[PDB]
Design a protein around this ligand. Sequence first.
Ligand SMILES: [Cl-]
Ligand SMILES: [Cl-]
Lengths: 95, 95
Amino acid sequence: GMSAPVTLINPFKVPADKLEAAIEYWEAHRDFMAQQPGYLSTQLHQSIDEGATYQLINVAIWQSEADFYQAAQKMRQALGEGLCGNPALYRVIRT
Amino acid sequence: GMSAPVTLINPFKVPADKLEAAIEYWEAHRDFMAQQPGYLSTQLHQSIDEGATYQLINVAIWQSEADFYQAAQKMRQALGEGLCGNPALYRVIRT
Ligand SMILES: [Cl-]
Ligand SMILES: [Cl-]
């Protein structure tokens, strides 16, 4: 197939009382990813209800699947309690 | 507090082999919500990997929390196997 822009959606389970630590962890990772070829933008969303399943959900845009996968492999090398993400790639199918 | 635009993020667990049915269910609901005061836009995202936890994730923008909650109460009245959402409201905190 041909490359096309993709969206990473990564919902996080944030431990009780550890939101700021989770944000700052996320920021360190964003700073690495933002330097990678194909990175376009991101929006880290915080739940209005602290009891939401996912108190943080990141939504990032990449130029292609290849660029994202290449960047994810590099981060395992560069950057390697209880914070749990579930990243997957998406495309928009309805509006 | 003062009202401000909010984002609904609703990740769906889609039963094996039932993606199209789930889309069409989602569309019927979108058609109701799109008529409600304060509805701004939506983007229904489909996973590139059929094995993702959430093969569909909707991301919708509403003018305020009040508008969304008002619309959600109305849909329970108007519209009432195994498809499971987890809606919550968010605001963007980092980019
Ligand atoms: Cl992320
Ligand atoms: Cl939805």
